[PDB]
Amino acid sequence: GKIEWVRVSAVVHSTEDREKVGEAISTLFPFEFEIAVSKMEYLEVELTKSSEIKKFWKNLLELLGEQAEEILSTLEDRIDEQNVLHIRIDKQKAYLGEVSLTSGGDPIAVKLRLVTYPSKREKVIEFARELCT
Amino acid sequence: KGKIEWVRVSAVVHSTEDREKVGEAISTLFPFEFEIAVSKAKGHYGNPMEYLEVELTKSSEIKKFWKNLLELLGEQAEEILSTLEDRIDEQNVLHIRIDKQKAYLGEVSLTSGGDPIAVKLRLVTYPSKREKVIEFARELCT
Amino acid sequence: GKIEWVRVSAVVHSTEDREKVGEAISTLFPFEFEIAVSMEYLEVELTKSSEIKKFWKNLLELLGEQAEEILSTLEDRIDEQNVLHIRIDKQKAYLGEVSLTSGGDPIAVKLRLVTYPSKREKVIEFARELC
Amino acid sequence: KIEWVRVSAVVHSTEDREKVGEAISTLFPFEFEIAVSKAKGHYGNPMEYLEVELTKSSEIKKFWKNLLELLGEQAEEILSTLEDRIDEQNVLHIRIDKQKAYLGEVSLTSGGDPIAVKLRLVTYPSKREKVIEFARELC
C-alpha cells in the first residue's frame, strides 16, 4: 500500500507562545513545510507530495529510534477504522529538539493515512509492520 | 473536501408578530422534523424581542437539509457561488439570509432586507485555510 | 383653519398578526373607531371635528417632548395638498407609547389642513398651531 | 467601561492604501492617525496593515455613539449574535463593509475582508455574561 498523506498538528494555549509551539513542530521536519494557524488556536501541517511523505517518515523513525519498536507493538490500537495511524509526540521535548512519544493529552499529533489494496485491516496492519521497519 | 460542522437557522419575532406564523416561514427551509429554541431579550432599541434558532448537528440532517436548501433556492445558487467571498467570514462561516416573508409562503429567496432568516453553516477543512475553505464551499454548491 | 380629516393607516405582512397590529393603532384613539381592512393595509378615518379634535389633543399629549420635533420640521412633514404626516413606531405603539420613527414600517398618521385660502404660507402658520 | 477601540484594515497589492484609508475615515467623526505595517493575507499574499487606536474616552465614547448611529437598524443584527462577536479576550467585533465604507456608507459585512472594529469590554465583576450583558448596554 501507500501513505495517502501525513498530518502534523498541535494546540496553543493562552499561556502558551505560538512561535514556541511551532518551533516544537519544526523538529519533525527535515525540509521546508508550512504551518496553518487557526482559532486556543491550532497549528496544522500537511504532507501530500509522496517524496516529502516518504522522506518525513523515514526521518521520524530515525529520530524515534528504539521507540519505533513500541509503535509496532501497538499498531493495532494506533490505527483507526479509517486506517489512519496515530503517533503522539511530546510537545515540550520536541521544542527542545528531542523526538519522543507521549501518552499525554496535549501532544503534537502525527497522523498517517494508510491505503492498501484493498483496505483490509489485516493488510493495513501488515503494511504498517513493514512500514515501521 | 471538508465538512459542515453545524448549521444554524434563525429569525426574530417582533411584538406585532406571530411565533407560529414565523416558525412556519422557518420550516419552509426544512424537509424533515425539527426543534426550535426560543430566547427573549430587548431589541436594538428598547423593544422586547423574541429570537428563534434551529441548529442541525447530525451530519444526516445537515446534508439532507443542505441538498434541500440548494434544491429550493435553485437558480439563485449561482449567485451564492459568485458571491462566496462576501458570505464566508474569517471564522469560516457561510452566511445565507432568506426573505422572511416569501418564506412564509414556501418560497426561498435571498434577500438584503433588514429582517430575514439567517442561515449560518460552519465549514471545517484540513488545513483550516481560507483557500481550502472557499474551495469546499464552492463544492457544496453541487 | 381646520382639519378636513384624519386617517391612520398601517400594514400587516404575512408573518404579522392583524389583531396585534390594530391594538397598536388603538393606542392613539381615546374613543370608538373602526378599522377598514383593505400583505394587507388597515385604515381608520376621522371626519367628525369632535373626534378630529379629541385625536389631535390626545396625540400631542402622548408625544410630549417629541411634539417639539414635529414643530421643527413642518415644511417637510407637510406635503403638497397641505397634508401633514406623522409616522410612528408600530412596535412601541403596540406597547403603548407614541414615538415618531424614521423606520420603514410605521403607523402613518396624516391629516389634511385647510386655510382660507389654503396658502402654503398661512397653512404652515396654522400647522404650527402647537401649544 | 470600554477599555480600547481599534479599527484596522488590510491592503492588497492591487489596492490603493489611500483609498483604503479613506474608507476608514468614513468611520471617524474626528481626526485620527493610521499606523502602517506588513502582514499576510488569507491566501498568504504580502499585505499592508492599517490600524487606528483610541484610548481617550472622549474620542472613544464619541466614536461608539456615532458608529452606532451610522449603523442604524443594523445594530439589531449585532445583538442577535452578540456572543460570537465576543472572544475570550473580551473583545467586541463589529465587521464593516470596506467597499461601502469607501463609498462613504456604513454597513455590516459577512465576507472575509472587512474593516475590523474591535472593542475591549471591561466589567467590574469580569465574567462572560458580565460583558455579554454589558454589550447589550451599548444599545
Side-chain angles (χ1 to χ4, degrees), chain A residues 1-22 24-57 59-68 70-119 124-133, chain B residues 1-19 22-41 43 46-49 51-57 59-66 68-77 79-96 98-130 133-138 140-142, chain C residues 1-40 42-67 69-86 88-118 123-124 126-131, chain D residues 1-37 39-64 66-75 78-82 84-123 125-128 131-139:
Chain A
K2 69 162 187 174
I3 298 287
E4 255 273 305
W5 51 242
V6 166
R7 288 172 176 180
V8 180
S9 49
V11 164
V12 190
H13 299 69
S14 305
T15 40
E16 240 168 347
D17 169 46
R18 178 162 56 207
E19 305 320 301
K20 270 173 185 162
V21 180
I25 296 197
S26 39
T27 288
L28 312 190
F29 295 83
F31 52 75
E32 265 202 298
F33 67 104
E34 205 149 38
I35 309 181
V37 183
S38 74
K39 278 57 175 182
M40 255 289 279
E41 61 196 2
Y42 301 109
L43 296 203
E44 304 179 316
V45 179
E46 185 176 48
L47 255 47
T48 32
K49 296 169 70 58
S50 56
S51 10
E52 306 182 325
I53 303 185
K54 191 76 285 94
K55 186 170 183 289
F56 168 85
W57 176 252
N59 184 232
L60 175 67
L61 286 184
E62 292 175 45
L63 295 175
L64 266 158
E66 217 55 71
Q67 314 184 66
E70 185 189 331
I71 305 296
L72 268 162
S73 328
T74 349
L75 299 184
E76 180 258 72
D77 297 276
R78 296 177 177 294
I79 307 169
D80 57 52
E81 52 171 305
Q82 280 57 61
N83 305 293
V84 177
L85 143 64
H86 304 285
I87 295 166
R88 289 187 303 284
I89 289 302
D90 185 301
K91 186 191 299 188
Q92 306 314 325
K93 301 207 214 304
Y95 174 66
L96 291 164
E98 171 183 7
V99 179
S100 154
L101 304 186
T102 189
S103 286
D106 172 46
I108 294 176
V110 171
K111 309 199 200 304
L112 292 100
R113 164 59 87 57
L114 315 179
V115 181
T116 49
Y117 305 103
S119 60
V124 192
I125 268 67
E126 231 187 293
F127 173 35
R129 299 283 176 73
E130 76 176 63
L131 220 50
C132 301
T133 295
Chain B
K1 182 95 279 80
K3 71 159 196 174
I4 310 180
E5 204 190 311
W6 50 253
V7 164
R8 298 174 189 169
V9 173
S10 46
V12 166
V13 194
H14 304 300
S15 308
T16 312
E17 297 193 288
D18 167 40
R19 239 177 299 187
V22 181
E24 266 52 356
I26 290 284
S27 75
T28 279
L29 302 175
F30 296 54
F32 55 69
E33 203 64 63
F34 65 91
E35 211 78 316
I36 293 193
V38 188
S39 168
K40 314 179 187 302
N47 285 100
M49 289 288 101
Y51 303 131
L52 300 185
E53 197 207 65
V54 178
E55 178 191 284
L56 276 52
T57 182
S59 72
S60 329
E61 316 177 298
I62 311 279
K63 288 305 184 294
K64 176 52 205 295
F65 161 56
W66 175 263
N68 173 196
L69 166 47
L70 206 69
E71 294 178 48
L72 259 35
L73 187 58
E75 208 55 62
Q76 323 180 75
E79 283 306 309
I80 301 286
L81 252 210
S82 52
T83 57
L84 278 173
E85 204 81 59
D86 303 302
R87 316 174 151 288
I88 303 173
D89 51 37
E90 302 172 300
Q91 317 320 295
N92 305 299
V93 186
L94 166 50
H95 302 283
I96 293 184
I98 297 70
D99 185 300
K100 157 111 70 67
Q101 294 310 308
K102 307 220 196 68
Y104 181 68
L105 303 175
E107 176 208 0
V108 179
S109 177
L110 309 182
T111 172
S112 309
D115 176 57
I117 292 176
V119 182
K120 355 284 166 302
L121 308 89
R122 204 190 193 303
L123 310 171
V124 308
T125 65
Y126 195 95
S128 221
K129 300 180 183 171
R130 178 72 176 183
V133 169
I134 215 278
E135 179 198 47
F136 168 45
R138 182 174 294 132
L140 244 39
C141 302
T142 73
Chain C
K2 74 153 194 179
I3 296 172
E4 197 74 48
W5 46 262
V6 164
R7 29 226 199 182
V8 178
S9 54
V11 164
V12 189
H13 316 284
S14 292
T15 60
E16 284 191 295
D17 167 11
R18 187 174 56 185
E19 300 305 289
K20 299 184 181 185
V21 180
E23 312 170 318
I25 284 179
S26 51
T27 303
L28 302 74
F29 293 92
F31 48 71
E32 219 87 61
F33 72 87
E34 299 138 69
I35 301 69
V37 184
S38 170
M39 48 170 215
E40 58 190 3
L42 297 200
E43 208 190 312
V44 181
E45 184 198 7
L46 304 182
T47 319
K48 308 186 193 183
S49 85
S50 336
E51 302 177 334
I52 298 179
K53 280 149 77 180
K54 300 189 186 194
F55 184 85
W56 187 245
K57 185 191 198 305
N58 144 289
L59 191 72
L60 306 193
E61 254 71 295
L62 296 184
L63 292 183
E65 305 290 62
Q66 295 171 294
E69 170 60 66
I70 309 173
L71 185 58
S72 311
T73 168
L74 310 189
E75 55 140 293
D76 297 297
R77 287 171 180 291
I78 316 293
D79 85 341
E80 56 248 53
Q81 319 93 28
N82 310 72
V83 174
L84 171 55
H85 301 270
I86 278 81
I88 74 163
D89 204 79
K90 175 186 298 178
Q91 295 316 315
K92 283 174 168 51
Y94 182 83
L95 298 176
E97 179 198 356
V98 302
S99 293
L100 321 71
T101 188
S102 283
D105 184 56
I107 291 176
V109 185
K110 73 294 289 187
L111 54 176
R112 189 186 218 175
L113 303 176
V114 187
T115 279
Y116 305 74
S118 297
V123 178
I124 295 299
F126 168 47
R128 79 188 315 82
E129 54 187 48
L130 287 78
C131 318
Chain D
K1 88 144 185 182
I2 190 58
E3 165 99 71
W4 53 261
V5 173
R6 290 187 260 200
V7 189
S8 57
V10 146
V11 191
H12 310 256
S13 316
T14 57
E15 268 187 302
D16 194 321
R17 75 142 77 195
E18 257 201 74
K19 297 204 187 190
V20 180
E22 189 176 355
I24 286 182
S25 287
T26 299
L27 291 179
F28 292 96
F30 54 71
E31 301 303 63
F32 62 93
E33 301 291 346
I34 313 177
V36 190
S37 72
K40 278 304 165 185
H42 295 174
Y43 299 100
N45 278 97
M47 234 128 269
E48 252 180 43
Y49 183 70
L50 307 193
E51 191 175 65
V52 182
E53 177 148 55
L54 301 178
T55 51
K56 317 181 180 183
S57 304
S58 168
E59 300 187 311
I60 296 188
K61 291 297 177 176
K62 183 174 181 183
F63 171 88
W64 178 242
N66 184 192
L67 184 67
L68 257 205
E69 165 180 291
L70 297 179
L71 277 159
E73 34 92 68
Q74 277 185 291
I78 305 177
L79 292 173
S80 46
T81 65
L82 209 51
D84 319 359
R85 307 174 172 282
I86 295 178
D87 49 321
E88 74 304 324
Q89 275 280 308
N90 293 329
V91 183
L92 177 58
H93 296 87
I94 306 288
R95 295 188 177 176
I96 300 312
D97 191 307
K98 194 179 199 184
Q99 303 308 315
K100 300 184 183 180
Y102 172 86
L103 293 184
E105 177 215 319
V106 175
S107 174
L108 287 178
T109 178
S110 282
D113 185 62
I115 290 172
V117 170
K118 300 128 161 190
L119 303 178
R120 184 68 174 77
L121 296 184
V122 190
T123 64
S126 179
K127 293 212 64 176
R128 184 59 177 169
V131 296
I132 292 181
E133 297 307 11
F134 175 31
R136 313 260 189 180
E137 178 133 302
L138 293 168
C139 80

